[PDB]
Amino acid sequence: PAGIIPTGNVLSTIEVCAHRCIFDFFKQIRSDDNSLYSAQFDILLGTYC
Amino acid sequence: VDQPVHNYMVKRIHKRSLSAAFAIASEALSLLSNTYVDGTEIDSSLRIR
Structure with a gap:
């Protein structure tokens, strides 16, 4: 998620674990997981001409 | 002709x-983890040391 504002409200909250053979990547967490807090990035340190 | x-x-x-x-001796930790139990005259000198 990365704490972004949701764009559209999703209706019909149903058991999405049964329809798992759709989408591309489905990760299900029980209550919370430590893999939601990651902050790796690459940085560009200036260009010289 | 060159370009x-x-x-x-x-x-x-x-x-x-x-x-x-950086090493700290065990007696130093004992002297600094009393939590308001000692305070006699000979203990203060060891604590300051």
Whole structure:
């Protein structure tokens, strides 16, 4: 998620674990997981001409 | 007849580290973890040392 504002409200909250053979990547967490807090990035340190 | 050239170069970072150690004796930890139990005359000198 990365704490972004949701764009559209999703209706019909149903058991999405049964329809798992759709989408591309489905990760299900029980209550919370430590893999939601990651902050790796690459940085560009200036260009010289 | 020659035509002018442009060059594009990319260099990357190299990660190192610096580490230094620092020891504290067990009696120093005992003297500094009393939590308001001692305070006699001979203990203050050892605590200050």
